[PDB]
């Protein structure tokens, strides 16, 4: 069989740690990675000539990617082209073979509707603009390129078509992870502690939600107290039924910074329908890689929760 997983976000294709957590979960033996900048129509020269970004529905051969994607189901080794990233040009293609798990990730994994009918499980990954700025400050600060504070003006110039081109895809994804500045902590820089939330969608079977103590009644839980000595500022979870874009969703939400072990196992003991064959398996998957960015906050929690639901969908698809 062929299963398929759609990831959506502008974190750079193969440049986000969610794929790394999926690699720790499945293994690169069982899955292969497909970037989606490879199906660009023409180059950055023709982007400058046509005056167009890399976000245009003109800018990709959306039909040949569909033909290779449908041929992925039939077992044959696909021949996919490669965007030469340094030059902006296009490599003559590479013949790669299908695997047990196939992923699809790029700026438009979901813009096509026939592949939206093809993708077995979908993830959009949203980022608020504040932690965009806080990540670009780290981007041009660690490199010391000295290109800051007009990239601020690149943000809002990149903004308007992006909301037209990309953001209506989240109206069709299953799970969407938003990352916000933390309401809890104020006297830091604006990107230390994240306020993350995984708006997951009901409906489509196999995918359960992961509900905190009750399906469908908003519950804001702080695990500090008689059995956990919370540091500053500690965790503040949330939950809530909601209808996002007129669709039955269930936001599960975490604010805070995981400072130690027991506060991360105590949270995991109380989530429900998390689909583990193993007690504390989510905590083990958190602490197999202490060095990954975002393990100390809820981003690494939610990414591995989504990947664990991907295990659930894979077990549903392969019996």
């Amino acid at each position: 069989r062929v299963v398929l997983i759609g990831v959506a976000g502008d974190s750079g294709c193969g440049k986000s740690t969610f794929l790394r957590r999926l690699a720790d979960l499945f293994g690169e033996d069982f899955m292969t990675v497909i970037c989606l900048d490879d199906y660009h129509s023409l180059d950055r020269k023709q982007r400058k000539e046509m005056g167009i970004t890399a976000l245009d529905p003109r800018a990709n051969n959306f039909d040949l990617m569909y033909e290779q994607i449908k041929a992925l189901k039939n077992g044959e080794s696909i021949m996919k082209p490669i965007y030469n990233h340094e030059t902006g040009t296009i490599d003559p293609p590479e013949k790669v073979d299908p695997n047990h798990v196939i992923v699809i990730e790029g700026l438009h994994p979901l813009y096509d509707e026939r592949v939206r009918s093809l993708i077995d499980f979908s993830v959009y990954l949203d980022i608020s603009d504040d932690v965009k700025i806080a990540w670009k400050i780290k981007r041009d600060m660690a490199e010391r390129g000295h290109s800051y504070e007009d990239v601020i003006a690149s943000i809002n110039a990149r903004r308007p078509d992006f909301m037209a081109y990309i953001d209506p895809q989240k109206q069709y994804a299953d799970v969407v992870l938003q990352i916000l500045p933390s309401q809890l902590a104020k006297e830091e820089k604006v990107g230390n502690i994240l306020r993350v939330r995984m708006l997951q969608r009901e409906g489509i079977p196999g995918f359960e939600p992961v509900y905190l103590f009750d399906e469908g009644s908003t519950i804001t839980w702080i695990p500090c107290g008689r059995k956990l000595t919370c540091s500053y500022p500690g965790i503040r979870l949330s939950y809530g039924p909601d209808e996002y874009y007129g669709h039955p969703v269930s936001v599960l939400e975490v604010d805070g910074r995981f400072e130690k072990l027991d506060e991360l196992i105590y949270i995991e003991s109380h989530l429900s329908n998390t689909s583990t064959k193993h007690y504390g398996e989510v905590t083990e998957l958190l602490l197999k890689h202490r060095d990954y960015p975002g393990s100390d906050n809820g981003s690494g929690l939610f990414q591995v929760l989504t990947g664990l639901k991907m295990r659930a969908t894979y077990e549903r698809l392969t019996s």
């Binding site: 027991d262 196992i265 193993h278 007690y279 083990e284 602490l287």
Partner: protein, 337 residues
Amino acid sequence: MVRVAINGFGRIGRNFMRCWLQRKANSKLEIVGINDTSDPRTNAHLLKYDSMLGIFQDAEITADDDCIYAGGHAVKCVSDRNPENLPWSAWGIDLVIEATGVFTSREGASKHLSAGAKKVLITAPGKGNIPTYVVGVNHHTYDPSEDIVSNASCTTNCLAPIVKVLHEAFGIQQGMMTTTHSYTGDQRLLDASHRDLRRARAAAMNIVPTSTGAAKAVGLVIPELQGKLNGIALRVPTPNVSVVDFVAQVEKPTIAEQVNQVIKEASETTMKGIIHYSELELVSSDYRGHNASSILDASLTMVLGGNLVKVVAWYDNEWGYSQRVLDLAEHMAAHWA
């Protein structure tokens, strides 16, 4: 000050003497008598030049045929195999340290009590209902009228603090162990005639297995786990240090990191000086002479299915066991009756 004696100046006796020479100032114990089957000229040499702990350095060792001068401190010495002909009341002996591996019975060890000694601490798992005590688990709960006390084996003395911590934190249903043990003096060097056949074979050549009941001695020192702990031992050609594997079946489920956290904080609150915790990738010979009675190896701890835990513990069965013997001896000196 308590005048103490040593029966059998072997490995445990030489290590006991060396430990007391390294812990002299804080001691209510004064070692005044030893007896081995050797003359006093030889065992002073064997005390000074240990081929495992190197040459002793701090104090001067010399002897003549009646006494041994260790660092200016004199100690008496005699040689007899009959425990009944021994000058105990002539020397004023409160506590004798049985370390021959011969007198494991109550009736055997009580020969010193009859011959004029007041208390006996035997460094072996004794036959019969001898009260056994491990420092760090139940070294408090001895009655001071119990004059014949027993420290358990080195394997039990290592394993029981870990089992105490895991039983208090998680609760234990069952538990196995398999200690990879250094070769001891009982094994014959070449293939020679011996009472047990698996100890009859060569020690430097072979992994010889043996069945031990020293896992069950944890069920003595922890009463609510008796009949639930059993294990075997593997003697491999390493001379000094050993490691013990321990498989427990806990019932409160957990992960591999949490048991390491539990034992790490237990190393710093209650089992301090008993259990050391090491997150290094060390090997066996980096534990020759370590003071703790169990070094938990952190990187190998694993949990399968939530309710099945495996730990491994380095321990030195010649130095740390002697340290626990001397700590038990001082702790019975502090509550002399």
